[PDB]
Structure 1
Amino acid sequence: MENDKGQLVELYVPRKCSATNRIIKADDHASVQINVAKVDEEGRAIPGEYVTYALSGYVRSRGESDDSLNRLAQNDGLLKNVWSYSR
């Protein structure tokens, strides 16, 4: 958010969960940020080339973190046939 003439306020625009689009708070110490490395044409991972996934403490404690990560990976194409929409 910001005031009347651009000039952004609200220090610390926070992160949002990649599964529930909920704000990861400044003390949600169960939240994680998975970095999955990219590969290019040789089978080897490139350092510094990641896809990032933020997972919140709620969805992690409830046990659906692996299924959320499965569907996110399959949407981003680095998984093929692990997740099924029609359960």
Structure 2
Amino acid sequence: MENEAGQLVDLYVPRKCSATNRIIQAKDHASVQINVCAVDAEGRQIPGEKTTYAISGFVRSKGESDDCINRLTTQDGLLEGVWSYQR
């Protein structure tokens, strides 16, 4: 949020989940974020370059973390032939 001066005033801006778009609480210990690096031809992944996904504790407890991660990787192009929108 911003005041009249236009400067963002708050303790922090909580990270929104990448699957269901929900706020991750400060004590949401079930929520985790995973990182997958970028690989070129013949392995030898490039250091310093990676894409991260945050999965909320509610999703992980419900058991939808695997499917949500599969969907996110398919959208970002890091995974193929495992997640189908048609179902």
Structure 1 and Structure 2 fold alike (TM over 0.5): yes
Q: For 2:43, what is the secondary structure of its paired residue? A: coil
Taking structure 1 as the reference length, the TM-score comes to: 0.94
Distance 1:41 1:4 in 2: 52
Can you list the C-alpha shifts for 1:35-56, whole angstroms capped at 9, x where unaligned? 0011133421122211010000
User: Counterpart of 1:16?
Assistant: 16
Taking structure 2 as the reference length, the TM-score comes to: 0.94
> Any stretches of 5+ residues in structure 1 without a counterpart?
none
Map 1:46-65 onto structure 2 (within 5 A): 46-65=46-65
Moved over 6 A (4+): none
Q: What number of residue pairs does the alignment pair up?
A: 87
Larger mean Cα displacement after TM superposition, 1-10 or 20-29: 1-10
Identity %: 75
> Any stretches of 5+ residues in structure 2 without a counterpart?
none
